[PDB]
Short mmCIF file of all heavy atoms in Angstrom, two decimals:
data_model
loop_
_atom_site.label_atom_id
_atom_site.label_comp_id
_atom_site.label_asym_id
_atom_site.label_seq_id
_atom_site.Cartn_x
_atom_site.Cartn_y
_atom_site.Cartn_z
N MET O 1 162.69 -69.84 88.52
CA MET O 1 162.81 -70.59 89.70
C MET O 1 161.88 -70.13 90.91
O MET O 1 161.64 -69.02 91.04
CB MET O 1 164.28 -70.55 90.22
CG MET O 1 165.22 -71.30 89.30
SD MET O 1 166.97 -71.14 89.79
CE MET O 1 166.75 -71.30 91.45
N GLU O 2 161.50 -71.15 91.73
CA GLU O 2 160.76 -70.83 92.89
C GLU O 2 161.71 -70.24 93.96
O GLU O 2 161.42 -69.32 94.61
CB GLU O 2 160.14 -72.11 93.50
CG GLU O 2 159.18 -72.79 92.56
CD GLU O 2 157.89 -71.97 92.33
OE1 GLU O 2 157.15 -71.80 93.34
OE2 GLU O 2 157.68 -71.55 91.20
N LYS O 3 162.94 -70.88 94.00
CA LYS O 3 164.02 -70.32 94.82
C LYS O 3 165.28 -71.17 94.63
O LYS O 3 165.22 -72.24 93.85
CB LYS O 3 163.56 -70.40 96.28
CG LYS O 3 163.32 -71.84 96.78
CD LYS O 3 163.01 -71.89 98.25
CE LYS O 3 164.29 -71.56 99.05
NZ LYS O 3 164.13 -72.04 100.51
N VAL O 4 166.34 -70.71 95.20
CA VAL O 4 167.63 -71.41 95.10
C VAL O 4 167.88 -72.12 96.46
O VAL O 4 168.14 -71.37 97.44
CB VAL O 4 168.76 -70.47 94.74
CG1 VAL O 4 170.03 -71.11 94.59
CG2 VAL O 4 168.43 -69.68 93.45
N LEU O 5 167.92 -73.33 96.51
CA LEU O 5 168.22 -74.10 97.77
C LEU O 5 169.72 -74.17 97.96
O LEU O 5 170.46 -74.15 97.03
CB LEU O 5 167.76 -75.55 97.64
CG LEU O 5 166.24 -75.69 97.45
CD1 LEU O 5 165.76 -77.05 96.94
CD2 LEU O 5 165.41 -75.20 98.53
N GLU O 6 170.11 -74.04 99.23
CA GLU O 6 171.55 -74.12 99.49
C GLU O 6 171.91 -75.50 100.15
O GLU O 6 171.21 -76.10 100.92
CB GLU O 6 171.93 -72.96 100.50
CG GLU O 6 171.45 -71.61 100.13
CD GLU O 6 171.60 -70.60 101.23
OE1 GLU O 6 172.67 -70.70 101.99
OE2 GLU O 6 170.79 -69.63 101.40
N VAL O 7 173.02 -76.06 99.69
CA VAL O 7 173.49 -77.35 100.18
C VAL O 7 174.99 -77.24 100.61
O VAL O 7 175.78 -76.65 99.82
CB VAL O 7 173.35 -78.47 99.18
CG1 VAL O 7 173.99 -79.77 99.65
CG2 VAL O 7 171.80 -78.69 98.88
N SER O 8 175.34 -77.68 101.82
CA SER O 8 176.68 -77.56 102.26
C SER O 8 177.53 -78.60 101.54
O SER O 8 177.09 -79.63 101.08
CB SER O 8 176.73 -77.81 103.75
OG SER O 8 176.45 -79.22 103.99
N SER O 9 178.85 -78.29 101.47
CA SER O 9 179.78 -79.19 100.84
C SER O 9 179.80 -80.52 101.44
O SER O 9 179.84 -81.56 100.84
CB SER O 9 181.14 -78.55 100.64
OG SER O 9 181.09 -77.36 99.88
N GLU O 10 179.91 -80.63 102.84
CA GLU O 10 179.93 -81.79 103.54
C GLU O 10 178.75 -82.67 103.13
O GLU O 10 178.92 -83.86 102.90
CB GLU O 10 179.97 -81.51 104.98
CG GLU O 10 179.67 -82.73 105.95
CD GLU O 10 179.72 -82.43 107.45
OE1 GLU O 10 180.00 -81.37 107.82
OE2 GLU O 10 179.51 -83.44 108.22
N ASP O 11 177.54 -82.09 103.11
CA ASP O 11 176.34 -82.89 102.87
C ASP O 11 176.34 -83.44 101.39
O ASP O 11 175.88 -84.53 101.20
CB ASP O 11 175.00 -82.04 102.99
CG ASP O 11 174.78 -81.82 104.61
OD1 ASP O 11 175.53 -82.41 105.37
OD2 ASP O 11 173.79 -81.14 104.88
N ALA O 12 176.85 -82.69 100.49
CA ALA O 12 176.80 -83.11 99.09
C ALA O 12 177.81 -84.18 98.91
O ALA O 12 177.59 -85.19 98.19
CB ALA O 12 177.25 -81.87 98.20
N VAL O 13 178.97 -84.03 99.54
CA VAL O 13 180.04 -85.10 99.56
C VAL O 13 179.46 -86.39 100.16
O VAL O 13 179.60 -87.50 99.55
CB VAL O 13 181.26 -84.71 100.32
CG1 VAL O 13 182.15 -85.84 100.44
CG2 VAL O 13 181.94 -83.53 99.52
N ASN O 14 178.78 -86.31 101.29
CA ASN O 14 178.26 -87.49 101.97
C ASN O 14 177.28 -88.23 101.09
O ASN O 14 177.29 -89.42 100.94
CB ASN O 14 177.70 -87.28 103.45
CG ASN O 14 178.69 -86.85 104.42
OD1 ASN O 14 180.00 -87.11 104.25
ND2 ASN O 14 178.35 -86.23 105.50
N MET O 15 176.33 -87.46 100.51
CA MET O 15 175.35 -87.91 99.57
C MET O 15 175.98 -88.75 98.43
O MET O 15 175.52 -89.77 98.01
CB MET O 15 174.38 -86.89 99.15
CG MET O 15 173.16 -87.51 98.37
SD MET O 15 172.35 -88.88 99.12
CE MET O 15 171.63 -88.12 100.59
N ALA O 16 177.01 -88.06 97.81
CA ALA O 16 177.68 -88.76 96.67
C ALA O 16 178.23 -90.10 97.04
O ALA O 16 178.25 -91.05 96.26
CB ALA O 16 178.76 -87.85 96.03
N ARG O 17 178.80 -90.25 98.25
CA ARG O 17 179.37 -91.53 98.74
C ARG O 17 178.36 -92.57 98.93
O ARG O 17 178.51 -93.71 98.51
CB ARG O 17 180.28 -91.23 99.99
CG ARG O 17 181.58 -90.55 99.81
CD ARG O 17 182.09 -89.95 101.08
NE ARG O 17 183.37 -89.24 100.97
CZ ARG O 17 184.04 -88.61 101.97
NH1 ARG O 17 183.53 -88.68 103.17
NH2 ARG O 17 185.14 -88.01 101.68
N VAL O 18 177.26 -92.08 99.43
CA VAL O 18 176.13 -92.98 99.72
C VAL O 18 175.47 -93.40 98.46
O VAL O 18 174.96 -94.59 98.37
CB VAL O 18 175.11 -92.22 100.74
CG1 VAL O 18 173.73 -92.93 100.68
CG2 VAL O 18 175.69 -92.22 102.11
N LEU O 19 175.34 -92.57 97.47
CA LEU O 19 174.93 -92.90 96.12
C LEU O 19 175.64 -94.05 95.54
O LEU O 19 175.15 -94.97 94.89
CB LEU O 19 174.81 -91.74 95.19
CG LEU O 19 173.63 -90.82 95.47
CD1 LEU O 19 173.81 -89.45 94.68
CD2 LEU O 19 172.27 -91.46 95.05
N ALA O 20 177.02 -94.12 95.65
CA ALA O 20 177.82 -95.16 95.07
C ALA O 20 177.54 -96.46 95.93
O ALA O 20 177.32 -97.52 95.35
CB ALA O 20 179.31 -94.80 95.14
N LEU O 21 177.53 -96.36 97.26
CA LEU O 21 177.47 -97.53 98.10
C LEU O 21 176.14 -98.27 97.96
O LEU O 21 176.13 -99.41 98.08
CB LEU O 21 177.71 -97.20 99.53
CG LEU O 21 179.13 -96.84 99.85
CD1 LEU O 21 179.16 -96.17 101.21
CD2 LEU O 21 180.02 -98.07 99.80
N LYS O 22 175.11 -97.49 97.99
CA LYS O 22 173.69 -98.05 98.07
C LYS O 22 172.98 -98.14 96.72
O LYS O 22 172.19 -99.09 96.53
CB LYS O 22 172.85 -97.36 99.06
CG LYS O 22 173.36 -97.27 100.43
CD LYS O 22 172.37 -96.69 101.40
CE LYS O 22 172.55 -97.14 102.89
NZ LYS O 22 171.38 -96.56 103.68
N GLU O 23 173.22 -97.29 95.80
CA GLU O 23 172.46 -97.24 94.57
C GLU O 23 173.33 -97.72 93.35
O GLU O 23 172.78 -97.84 92.25
CB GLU O 23 171.85 -95.86 94.21
CG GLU O 23 171.18 -95.22 95.47
CD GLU O 23 169.71 -95.45 95.45
OE1 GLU O 23 169.22 -96.21 94.56
OE2 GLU O 23 169.02 -94.89 96.34
N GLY O 24 174.62 -97.97 93.57
CA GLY O 24 175.47 -98.26 92.47
C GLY O 24 175.76 -97.12 91.52
O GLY O 24 176.17 -97.23 90.40
N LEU O 25 175.54 -95.86 91.98
CA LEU O 25 175.70 -94.71 91.05
C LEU O 25 177.00 -93.94 91.52
O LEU O 25 177.08 -93.32 92.60
CB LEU O 25 174.62 -93.77 91.17
CG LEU O 25 173.28 -94.45 90.55
CD1 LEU O 25 172.06 -93.62 90.83
CD2 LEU O 25 173.48 -94.70 89.10
N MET O 26 178.07 -94.11 90.73
CA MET O 26 179.35 -93.44 90.97
C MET O 26 179.19 -92.06 90.37
O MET O 26 179.46 -91.81 89.13
CB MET O 26 180.43 -94.24 90.18
CG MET O 26 181.82 -93.62 90.16
SD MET O 26 182.66 -93.89 91.77
CE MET O 26 183.34 -95.53 91.42
N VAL O 27 178.87 -91.13 91.20
CA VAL O 27 178.66 -89.69 90.66
C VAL O 27 179.45 -88.69 91.44
O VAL O 27 180.03 -88.96 92.50
CB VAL O 27 177.23 -89.37 90.74
CG1 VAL O 27 176.45 -90.25 89.85
CG2 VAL O 27 176.75 -89.37 92.11
N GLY O 28 179.49 -87.43 90.91
CA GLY O 28 180.31 -86.44 91.57
C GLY O 28 179.59 -85.65 92.64
O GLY O 28 178.43 -85.92 92.92
#
């Protein structure tokens, strides 16, 4: 790995909701 990126839980959650609404991808 080049490095390990950090992602907050809030952001990961928001992204998942947005993936379902806009891309049709129901993911975790």
Side-chain angles (χ1 to χ4, degrees):
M1 296 175 38
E2 300 293 294
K3 59 176 293 197
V4 182
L5 301 168
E6 309 171 34
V7 173
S8 69
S9 297
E10 168 179 359
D11 289 355
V13 173
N14 293 342
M15 188 48 66
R17 286 160 180 182
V18 163
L19 282 167
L21 289 167
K22 300 185 156 191
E23 313 262 6
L25 298 169
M26 173 79 86
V27 298

